[PDB]
Structures are given as structure tokens and as C-alpha cells.
Amino acid sequence: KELKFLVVDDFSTMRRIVRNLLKELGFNNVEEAEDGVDALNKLQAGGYGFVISDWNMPNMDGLELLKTIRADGAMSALPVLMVTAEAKKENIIAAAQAGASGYVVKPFTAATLEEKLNKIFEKLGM
Numbered sequence: 001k002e003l004k005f006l007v008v009d010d011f012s013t014m015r016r017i018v019r020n021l022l023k024e025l026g027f028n029n030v031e032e033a034e035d036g037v038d039a040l041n042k043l044q045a046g047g048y049g050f051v052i053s054d055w056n057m058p059n060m061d062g063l064e065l066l067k068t069i070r071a072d073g074a075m076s077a078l079p080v081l082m083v084t085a086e087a088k089k090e091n092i093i094a095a096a097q098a099g100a101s102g103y104v105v106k107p108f109t110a111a112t113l114e115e116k117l118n119k120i121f122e123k124l125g126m
């Protein structure tokens with residue numbers, strides 16, 4: 001599957017981990033973004049096929065980034081995997097209403113990530 005991923009997380013250590021987990025699953029075309037604003041700049045360049053986004057981030061959080069993607073004429077169907085942390089239980093109902101493609105709690109292993117990605121590829125038909 002030739003898919004270009006965008007990994008968005010305000011902690012540089014976590015972006016690196018997720019990127020290396022994707023590399024182990026065979027995905028080598030992975031770009032990183034620091035928050036929702038940075039993510040908008042990368043997405044506008046085009047070519048992205050999947051977004052993995054942390055929920056809590058400064059400047060623009062994962063929910064506002066999701067809602068922006070979903071309102072965009074060309075990118076409204078872009079899959080978005082929402083990432084939450086044990087620290088805070090998020091407003092899942094709002095992400096579900098905005099069309100999140102799925103949810104996963106970090107930290108996660110490549111095995112868990114693979115199972116989440118396979119489930120989304122199947123449910124959406126990618």
C-alpha cells in the first residue's frame with residue numbers, strides 16, 4: 001500500500017516512535033507535524049493519504065484539525081486516526097460526530113498500530 005502518512009504530535013519523542021513503528025510495518029513515506037497549524041501547512045502541499053493525530057496539542061488540537069480536514073472540499077475523506085493518552089479521557093462523542101476514522105491510546109506497539117490500520121483499511125475500503 002503506497003500511502004504517505006502525516007504523524008502529528010507536540011512531543012518530538014512520540015512522533016519519532018510512531019514514525020519508526022510505521023517503518024517496521026513497511027510504511028516509509030512518513031512526515032511529521034508539531035501541532036494542528038503545522039499539520040495544515042503540510043497537508044496543503046498535497047499527497048497525503050492518512051493522518052495519525054494526537055488529540056491534545058498547543059496552537060490547534062486534534063479535534064479542531066479533524067473538523068478542518070472534514071470541511072475541506074478535496075480532503076474531506078482523508079482517514080484520521082485520533083490518538084489519546086491515559087492522562088485525559090477525551091470528548092469521544094465530538095470526535096465521533098466529526099467523523100474520526102478510529103481511536104488508539106498512546107503509547108502503543110507496532111502490533112496494536114497494525115491491527116488498528118488494518119481495521120480502518122477494511123471498513124473504509126483502502
Ligand SMILES: [Mg+2]
Nearest residue numbers: 010054056057
Ligand atoms: Mg500532545
